[PDB]
């Protein structure tokens, strides 16, 4: 019956931005008014649709992209943006339809001993295509000479950690970001609001 929005937004451990989980939501009724009017969300920005028409609208598929980014990087999850995350970790298409949802997760992800589990891609040969998922751990070739699998000068580990601390400012706190992508195609609109 009801769509499993609760599982996506209450998951105990979220994924890293570089490898972002893709869940397709179908064959259920989607209640949006519980999320929209919640007092636990910090960001709720919709692109291409109006924030209140979601209940009326019917879509073929809803895709929930769940990734952890740093506070200052929340503004990069939008169409037509650049940056370390926007270009190398998670790229949105220019004709994006959906809502970008984010909330402060400082009391859940940050550790006093240092949270290093979260990672982000720092070096890539080229920028990502929309909804491209790059999970390669291949050594970055900065120069014209081969690395041969060994690090050092001009051969670096492409991933980098965040290092979340409880004493950091708001701009460096972890924030969980769920992106609900609305895809419509020539199929019955099995997803519809109440």
């Amino acid at each position, epitope marked *: 019956n009801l769509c499993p929005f609760g599982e996506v937004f209450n998951a105990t451990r979220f994924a890293s931005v570089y490898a972002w989980n893709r869940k397709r939501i179908s064959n259920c009724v989607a209640d949006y008014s519980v999320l929209y009017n919640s007092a636990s969300f910090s960001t709720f920005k919709c692109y291409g649709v109006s924030p209140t028409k979601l209940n009326d609208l019917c879509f073929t598929n809803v895709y929930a992209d769940s990734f952890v980014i740093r506070g200052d990087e929340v503004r990069q999850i939008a169409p037509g943006q650049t940056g370390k995350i926007a270009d190398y970790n998670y790229k949105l298409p220019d004709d994006f339809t959906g809502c970008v949802i984010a909330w402060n997760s400082n009391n859940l992800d940050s550790k006093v001993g240092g949270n290093y589990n979260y990672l982000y891609r*720092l*070096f890539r*040969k080229s920028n990502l295509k929309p909804f491209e998922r790059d999970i390669s751990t291949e050594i970055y070739q*900065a*120069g*014209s*000479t*081969p690395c041969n699998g060994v690090e*050092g*000068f*001009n051969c*670096y*580990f492409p991933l*980098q950690s965040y290092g979340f601390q409880p004493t950091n400012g708001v701009g460096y706190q972890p924030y969980r970001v769920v992106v609900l992508s609305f895809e419509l195609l020539h199929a019955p609109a099995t997803v519809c609001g109440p």
Partner: antibody
Amino acid sequence: QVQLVQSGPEVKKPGTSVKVSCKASGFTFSSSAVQWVRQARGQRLEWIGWIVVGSGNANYAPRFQERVTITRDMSTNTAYMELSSLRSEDTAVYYCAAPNCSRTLCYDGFNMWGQGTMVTV
Amino acid sequence: EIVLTQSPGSLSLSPGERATLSCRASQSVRSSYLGWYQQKPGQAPRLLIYGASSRATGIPDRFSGSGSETDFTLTISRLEPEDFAVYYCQQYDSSPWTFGQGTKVEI
């Protein structure tokens, strides 16, 4: 005109800690990495340690590993090096050098060098 | 610690003839991860070659390099008056990146 402009010379008493920095301009600093070397007057060059500014991973030579903290500030395109417990023999000219790095690709050698700063203890 | 032996310590040679400089490594070093620097007196060093045999930009054709696993050689075809300086080799293969003793070329 890709250069690396550091600060001027300093003369400090023994036991204090000195802060040295190099400010990059004209090229993409984040892709590149900075190596720190020192050369006393009339002697050879000694390698303090290098840092990749983008990653922030700092490697230090074994002799000076305990006493050097090599940090970077990406916002101002500046690499910092700090020496503690300055002893009389530590007086030397300190250099910083980074490869000319474009966004897509980097130069295989350490092309750009600094002007050199004298530190007297 | 990869000690870089340098021979000879000093070199006295007239301009116009050939010169052979030697950078000796304690153990084998990757050819690509090496560079040569010219330090003029009272000046910063300046890179001439990288990867043993690949000349860097802005250096004339006279300077040349020979590559091998444990032997590295720099050769100057024609000595010029401004080319008399202390030359240093560096290995980027393994940390620490040591420097050689330095060979001074004079007349």
